[PDB]
């Protein structure tokens, strides 16, 4: 079974990708990278008023199908 998810950025852009329940936050960024063109080591996810990261999985944040997530880029050197 494969569920779908959406991730909007601070620019308004809306990305539509698919993810699994066993997958992880970092994974969602992996595929998104080929979409927008940003590394997962810079972009992050926000849902349920909590910072979604590789530290947890999708099922950890109860991320179901058609989830409204945001995009946050925290440049290190830039």
């Amino acid at each position: 079974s494969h569920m779908q998810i959406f991730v909007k950025t601070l620019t308004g852009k809306t990305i539509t990708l698919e993810v699994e329940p066993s997958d992880t936050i970092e994974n969602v960024k992996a595929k998104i990278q080929d979409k927008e063109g940003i590394p997962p080591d810079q972009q992050r996810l926000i849902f349920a008023g909590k910072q979604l990261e590789d530290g947890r999985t999708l099922s950890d944040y109860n991320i179901q199908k058609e989830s409204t997530l945001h995009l946050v880029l925290r440049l290190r050197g830039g």
């Binding site: 601070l10 849902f47 349920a48 008023g49 909590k50 910072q51 990261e53 945001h70 946050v72 925290r74």
Partner: protein, 44 residues
């Protein structure tokens, strides 16, 4: 008092009370732009 629909009522980043009768999208929307501006990626 039937308010809620969010994991936080006040931005724990910039200590900013979110608007009432808000939604999970509202808090997250700001939490995203705030987080990006913040320097510490603490887990709240």
């Amino acid at each position: 008092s039937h308010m809620g629909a969010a994991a936080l009522r006040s931005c724990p980043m910039c200590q900013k009370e979110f608007a009432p009768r808000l939604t999970q999208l509202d808090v997250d929307s700001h939490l995203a732009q705030c987080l990006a501006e913040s320097t510490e990626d603490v887990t709240w």
